[PDB]
């Protein structure tokens, strides 16, 4: 009996006869399914997981510098040379500087100077593809007839894009089917899944291709090879034979600022949780018998345990306590503008409200859909029944 306090909840009216109910399931939203001779059921999408995502590109946002040397040549002696300027792990910068008799050349003029440093990545971010065929959907169900504390039988199912049909067994209520259709995973070909320090987002595909950081476009090899490492290393203040190397420091906070307004998603562990939904489902519930119609009406008296409360959608929720070993028995519940007797005016959300326990002071909750204006919630039979006024809109 989830979906009571949910703000984004849809009330779908079915068709009397054929087992037809077409629902649209989101994250954070749910639906109350009401059939003709069948119990009202809540259906919500709670978990979207994506497994075994393939890496696409990794960016380095914190670098380190290592064994660094320079090489200088006198004027007319050509351009400076280091053996490690031929190394894929080294960043090098060549420049011209004033040489003379004081630093060690036989001529006065401009000499060549090169400086190299070894690049190493301390911390990196990784982008992955999702490929909708490895998604997994987890759906939660529950029926009505329960009590307030029991918020938190009730079933759960798993759905795959290529295994979209599912059936769950709900105690004495029977079974319900679901034949579903996803639509909005990457929407098509876009939306990489990014992993930073220990949290994860879903980024635009083109935006990720343009991050100005060192990067290697594989999954991993022995000692990766960083492209465009020149973006995090600065050379400055060349003297005559030594050029100082600077590393720009962590760019983590920089991408957080560029990640303001992106869609986040947790992950624990190695399976990706998602906060986006939008899968449509055709539910067939012809094999869903009610629960018990062979009960009798409860003869004893009721009492309001909580003030009946209005939900976000105008529906009224009521909990009563039943004193008597009469149970199990049907609860008499109805509506408005009497001065008995006594025409039902609204409609219930709970199909067949029942008392479940025999003895002696059991609790039970139900939900109504009241008519506009003034109305009277009446629970109980004949005399010693309990009534509560209600006003809609």
């Amino acid at each position: 009996i989830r979906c009571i306090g949910v703000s984004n909840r849809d009330f779908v009216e079915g068709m009397s006869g054929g087992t037809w109910v077409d629902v649209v399931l989101e994250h954070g939203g749910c639906v109350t399914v009401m059939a003709q001779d069948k119990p009202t059921v809540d259906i919500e999408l709670v978990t979207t997981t994506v497994s075994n995502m393939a890496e696409v590109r990794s960016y380095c946002y914190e670098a380190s510098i290592s064994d660094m040397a320079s090489d200088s040549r006198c004027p007319t002696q050509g351009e400076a040379y280091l053996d490690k300027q031929s190394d894929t792990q080294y960043v090098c910068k060549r420049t011209l500087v004033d040489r003379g008799w004081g630093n060690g050349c036989g001529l006065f003029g401009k000499g060549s100077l090169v400086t190299c440093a070894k690049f190493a990545c301390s911390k990196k971010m990784t982008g992955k593809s999702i490929q909708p065929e490895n998604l997994e959907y987890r759906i939660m169900l529950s029926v009505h007839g329960s009590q307030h504390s029991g918020m938190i039988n009730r079933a759960k199912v798993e759905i795959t894009p290529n295994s979209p049909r599912a059936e769950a067994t709900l105690g004495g209520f029977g079974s319900l089917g679901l034949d579903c259709e996803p639509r909005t995973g990457l929407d098509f070909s876009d939306l990489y899944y990014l992993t930073m320090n220990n949290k994860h987002w879903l980024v635009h595909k083109e935006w990720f291709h343009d991050i100005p950081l060192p990067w290697h476009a594989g999954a991993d090899t022995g000692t990766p090879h960083w492209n465009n490492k020149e973006a995090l290393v600065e050379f400055k203040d060349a003297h005559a034979k030594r050029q100082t190397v600077v590393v720009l420091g962590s760019q983590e906070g920089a991408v957080h600022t560029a990640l303001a307004g992106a869609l986040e998603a947790e992950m624990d562990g190695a399976k990706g949780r998602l906060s986006s939904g939008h899968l449509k489902c055709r539910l067939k519930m012809d094999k869903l018998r009610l629960k018990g119609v062979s009960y009798s009406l409860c003869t004893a008296a009721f009492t309001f345990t909580k003030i009946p409360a209005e939900t976000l959608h105008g529906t009224v929720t009521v909990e009563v306590q039943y004193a008597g070993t009469d149970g199990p028995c049907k609860v008499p519940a109805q509506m408005a503008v009497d001065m008995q007797t006594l025409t039902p005016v609204g409609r219930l959300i709970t199909a067949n409200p029942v008392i479940t326990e025999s003895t002696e002071n059991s609790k039970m909750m139900l939900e109504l859909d009241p008519p506009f204006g003034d109305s009277y919630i009446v629970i109980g039979v004949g005399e010693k029944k309990i009534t509560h006024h209600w006003h809609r809109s």
């Epitope: 064994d67 040397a69 050509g78 040379y81 053996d83 490690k84 031929s86 190394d87 894929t88 190299c116």
Partner: antibody, heavy 126, light 116 residues
């Protein structure tokens, strides 16, 4: 992966020889080549160098203007045209293959001499 | 640029042989890729060791695991280390580096003599 040299022999000062280096077992067009020589009972001296395409050659000073390095990748052969030999050119000449690189830069930037040929003896004397 | 090597070096059997190679005044051992070759009588040289640092090295094809290199920056000298010295290690060892100007410089070669 083997290298063999041909075209040794006895030349007179001012004559010419054509050393050849036959290579097999690797894509000969992806490798820089070198000729290294060694006089009888002496050290190693680098003679010339050639790129994998053939449009960039380097020469030791003691050889410039005389020797012509070249390569025809189709026949899988490196060449060393030796012109106007001097008595000091008498030595064994090996052809050596450098280490391969994926462009200009490589892993560790190593460019040492992978494999050496057997060597041809060149004697020049009147 | 020149590479100086002792013409002959003798080292006792089973011990280590530190074959040195001192670079000229205009080079720094710290930033050189040192290439070592082994040449036995009647046969062409073959790659013995690439050495730049203890975390950046490479054994030549078939060369045992008892060989390594080192550098002493204070004397501008590279060292070829051969431990577990067996008489099969008697040969000439040539150190070689590349430069953009002289284009390939070979040492004079050190003839190893395994005593005993």
């Amino acid at each position: 992966v083997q290298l063999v040299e041909s075209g040794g022999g006895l030349a007179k000062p001012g004559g010419s020889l054509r050393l050849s280096c036959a290579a097999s077992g690797f894509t000969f067009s992806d490798y820089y080549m070198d000729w290294v020589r060694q006089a009888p009972g002496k050290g190693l001296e680098w003679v010339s160098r050639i790129s994998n395409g053939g449009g960039s050659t380097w020469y030791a000073d003691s050889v410039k203007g005389r020797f012509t390095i070249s390569r025809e990748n189709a026949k899988n052969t490196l060449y060393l045209q030796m012109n106007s030999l001097r008595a000091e050119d008498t030595a064994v000449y090996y052809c050596a293959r450098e280490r391969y690189c994926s462009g200009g830069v490589c892993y560790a930037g190593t460019k040492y001499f992978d494999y050496w040929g057997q060597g041809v003896l060149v004697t020049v004397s009147s | 640029p020149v590479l100086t090597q002792p013409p002959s070096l003798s080292a006792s059997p089973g011990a280590s042989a530190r074959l040195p190679c001192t670079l000229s005044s205009d080079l720094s051992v710290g930033s050189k890729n040192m290439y070592w070759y082994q040449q036995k009588p009647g046969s062409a040289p073959r790659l013995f060791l690439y050495y730049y640092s203890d975390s950046d090295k490479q054994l030549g094809p078939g060369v045992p695991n008892r060989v390594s290199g080192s550098k002493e920056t204070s004397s501008n000298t590279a060292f070829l280390l051969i431990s577990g010295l067996q008489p099969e290690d008697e040969a000439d060892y040539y150190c070689q580096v590349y430069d953009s100007s002289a284009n390939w410089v070979f040492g004079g070669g050190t003839r190893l003599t395994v005593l005993g």
